[PDB]
Design a protein around this motif. Structure first.
Motif, PDB file in Angstrom:
ATOM      1  N   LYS A   1       0.839  -1.226   0.000  1.00  0.00           N
ATOM      2  CA  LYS A   1       0.000   0.000   0.000  1.00  0.00           C
ATOM      3  C   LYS A   1       0.848   1.239   0.000  1.00  0.00           C
ATOM      4  CE  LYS A   1      -3.846   2.563   1.977  1.00  0.00           C
ATOM      5  NZ  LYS A   1      -4.550   2.157   3.163  1.00  0.00           N
ATOM      6  N   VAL A   2       0.499   2.184  -0.879  1.00  0.00           N
ATOM      7  CA  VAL A   2       1.159   3.498  -0.943  1.00  0.00           C
ATOM      8  C   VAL A   2       0.157   4.502  -0.371  1.00  0.00           C
ATOM      9  CG1 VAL A   2       2.025   5.362  -2.484  1.00  0.00           C
ATOM     10  CG2 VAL A   2       2.603   2.965  -3.014  1.00  0.00           C
ATOM     11  N   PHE A   3       0.525   5.134   0.733  1.00  0.00           N
ATOM     12  CA  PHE A   3      -0.326   6.125   1.411  1.00  0.00           C
ATOM     13  C   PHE A   3      -0.125   7.536   0.854  1.00  0.00           C
ATOM     14  CE2 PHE A   3      -1.934   4.061   5.435  1.00  0.00           C
ATOM     15  CZ  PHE A   3      -1.286   2.841   5.303  1.00  0.00           C
ATOM     16  N   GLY A   4      -1.214   8.298   0.855  1.00  0.00           N
ATOM     17  CA  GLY A   4      -1.101   9.735   0.868  1.00  0.00           C
ATOM     18  C   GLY A   4      -0.487  10.253   2.159  1.00  0.00           C
ATOM     19  N   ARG A   5       0.081  11.469   2.072  1.00  0.00           N
ATOM     20  CA  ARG A   5       0.681  12.112   3.256  1.00  0.00           C
ATOM     21  C   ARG A   5      -0.275  12.168   4.444  1.00  0.00           C
ATOM     22  NH1 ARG A   5       0.599  17.433   5.091  1.00  0.00           N
ATOM     23  NH2 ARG A   5      -0.355  18.130   3.105  1.00  0.00           N
ATOM     24  N   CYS A   6      -1.423  12.828   4.260  1.00  0.00           N
ATOM     25  CA  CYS A   6      -2.393  12.960   5.373  1.00  0.00           C
ATOM     26  C   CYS A   6      -2.996  11.631   5.760  1.00  0.00           C
ATOM     27  CB  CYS A   6      -3.522  13.951   5.022  1.00  0.00           C
ATOM     28  SG  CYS A   6      -2.864  15.625   4.893  1.00  0.00           S
ATOM     29  N   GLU A   7      -3.178  10.771   4.747  1.00  0.00           N
ATOM     30  CA  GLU A   7      -3.691   9.451   4.996  1.00  0.00           C
ATOM     31  C   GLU A   7      -2.777   8.665   6.005  1.00  0.00           C
ATOM     32  OE1 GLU A   7      -3.670   6.986   1.545  1.00  0.00           O
ATOM     33  OE2 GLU A   7      -5.172   5.557   2.266  1.00  0.00           O
ATOM     34  N   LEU A   8      -1.452   8.794   5.849  1.00  0.00           N
ATOM     35  CA  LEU A   8      -0.510   8.021   6.688  1.00  0.00           C
ATOM     36  C   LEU A   8      -0.433   8.701   8.043  1.00  0.00           C
ATOM     37  CD1 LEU A   8       1.566   5.705   7.095  1.00  0.00           C
ATOM     38  CD2 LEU A   8       3.281   7.209   6.216  1.00  0.00           C
ATOM     39  N   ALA A   9      -0.441  10.029   8.056  1.00  0.00           N
ATOM     40  CA  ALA A   9      -0.471  10.746   9.326  1.00  0.00           C
ATOM     41  C   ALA A   9      -1.636  10.244  10.211  1.00  0.00           C
ATOM     42  CB  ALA A   9      -0.566  12.250   9.037  1.00  0.00           C
ATOM     43  N   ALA A  10      -2.804  10.111   9.567  1.00  0.00           N
ATOM     44  CA  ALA A  10      -4.009   9.646  10.248  1.00  0.00           C
ATOM     45  C   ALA A  10      -3.896   8.239  10.732  1.00  0.00           C
ATOM     46  CB  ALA A  10      -5.228   9.781   9.325  1.00  0.00           C
ATOM     47  N   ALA A  11      -3.286   7.365   9.915  1.00  0.00           N
ATOM     48  CA  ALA A  11      -3.018   5.986  10.317  1.00  0.00           C
ATOM     49  C   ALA A  11      -2.001   5.847  11.473  1.00  0.00           C
ATOM     50  CB  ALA A  11      -2.533   5.222   9.078  1.00  0.00           C
ATOM     51  N   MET A  12      -0.898   6.581  11.374  1.00  0.00           N
ATOM     52  CA  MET A  12       0.074   6.643  12.462  1.00  0.00           C
ATOM     53  C   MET A  12      -0.515   7.169  13.791  1.00  0.00           C
ATOM     54  SD  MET A  12       3.504   7.932  10.429  1.00  0.00           S
ATOM     55  CE  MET A  12       4.652   6.720   9.809  1.00  0.00           C
ATOM     56  N   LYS A  13      -1.288   8.267  13.673  1.00  0.00           N
ATOM     57  CA  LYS A  13      -1.973   8.789  14.878  1.00  0.00           C
ATOM     58  C   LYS A  13      -2.908   7.706  15.461  1.00  0.00           C
ATOM     59  CE  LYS A  13      -4.852  12.730  16.398  1.00  0.00           C
ATOM     60  NZ  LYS A  13      -4.151  13.829  17.089  1.00  0.00           N
ATOM     61  N   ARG A  14      -3.721   7.037  14.612  1.00  0.00           N
ATOM     62  CA  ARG A  14      -4.584   5.927  15.116  1.00  0.00           C
ATOM     63  C   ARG A  14      -3.784   4.887  15.929  1.00  0.00           C
ATOM     64  NH1 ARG A  14      -5.853   1.742  16.395  1.00  0.00           N
ATOM     65  NH2 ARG A  14      -7.093  -0.091  15.925  1.00  0.00           N
ATOM     66  N   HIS A  15      -2.541   4.621  15.491  1.00  0.00           N
ATOM     67  CA  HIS A  15      -1.721   3.518  16.044  1.00  0.00           C
ATOM     68  C   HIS A  15      -0.736   3.945  17.143  1.00  0.00           C
ATOM     69  CE1 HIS A  15      -3.545   1.604  12.493  1.00  0.00           C
ATOM     70  NE2 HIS A  15      -3.433   0.492  13.193  1.00  0.00           N
ATOM     71  N   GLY A  16      -0.835   5.196  17.589  1.00  0.00           N
ATOM     72  CA  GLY A  16      -0.202   5.607  18.834  1.00  0.00           C
ATOM     73  C   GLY A  16       1.159   6.265  18.718  1.00  0.00           C
ATOM     74  N   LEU A  17       1.498   6.741  17.517  1.00  0.00           N
ATOM     75  CA  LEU A  17       2.804   7.381  17.278  1.00  0.00           C
ATOM     76  C   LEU A  17       2.914   8.867  17.663  1.00  0.00           C
ATOM     77  CD1 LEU A  17       4.512   5.916  14.094  1.00  0.00           C
ATOM     78  CD2 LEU A  17       4.858   5.491  16.519  1.00  0.00           C
ATOM     79  N   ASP A  18       1.823   9.629  17.556  1.00  0.00           N
ATOM     80  CA  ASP A  18       1.874  11.075  17.832  1.00  0.00           C
ATOM     81  C   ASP A  18       2.357  11.403  19.252  1.00  0.00           C
ATOM     82  OD1 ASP A  18       1.728  13.882  17.976  1.00  0.00           O
ATOM     83  OD2 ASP A  18      -0.471  13.805  18.153  1.00  0.00           O
ATOM     84  N   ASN A  19       3.487  12.094  19.288  1.00  0.00           N
ATOM     85  CA  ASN A  19       4.235  12.338  20.488  1.00  0.00           C
ATOM     86  C   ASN A  19       4.704  11.078  21.265  1.00  0.00           C
ATOM     87  OD1 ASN A  19       5.095  15.148  20.845  1.00  0.00           O
ATOM     88  ND2 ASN A  19       4.407  14.879  22.986  1.00  0.00           N
TER      89      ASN A  19
END
Ligand code: NA
Length: 129
Positions: A1-19
């Protein structure tokens, strides 16, 4: 899968990466952009014969087993193929282990050389988050 920029940001945030370990989400999106261009199936062979896998180019020398990296370790306890899934879960969770090991995001060469000390927030500008 190739993500869009915002699409991956949203996926990473869902999975607990933000901060995660104090590393804002922009850091993670920037690292992914320069490691894999947002492609879960990215692979690159290193000069020592190890290979990097996935969206964050995690290295079979230490972090996964691929069967062709002699004398290496498997610290995330996973086949390296797990890091290529459309589902970013295995990559995010092994990355949490890598970034928590002493060196933070300096583990990722692209992060050190292209993201660190930059305005990483740009990487999440315009994204519904
Ligand atoms: Na390994």
């Amino acid at each position: 899968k190739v993500f869009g920029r915002c699409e991956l940001a949203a996926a990473m945030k869902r999975h607990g990466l933000d901060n995660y370990r104090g590393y804002s989400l922009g850091n993670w999106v920037c690292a992914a952009k320069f490691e894999s261009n947002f492609n879960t199936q990215a692979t690159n062979r290193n000069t020592d014969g190890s290979t990097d896998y996935g969206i964050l180019q995690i290295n079979s020398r230490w972090w996964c087993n691929d069967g062709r990296t002699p004398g290496s370790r498997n610290l995330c306890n996973i086949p390296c193929s797990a890091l290529l899934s459309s589902d970013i879960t295995a990559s995010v969770n092994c990355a949490k282990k890598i970034v928590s090991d002493g060196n933070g995001m300096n583990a990722w060469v692209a992060w050190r050389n292209r993201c660190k000390g930059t305005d990483v927030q740009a990487w999440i500008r315009g994204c519904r988050l």
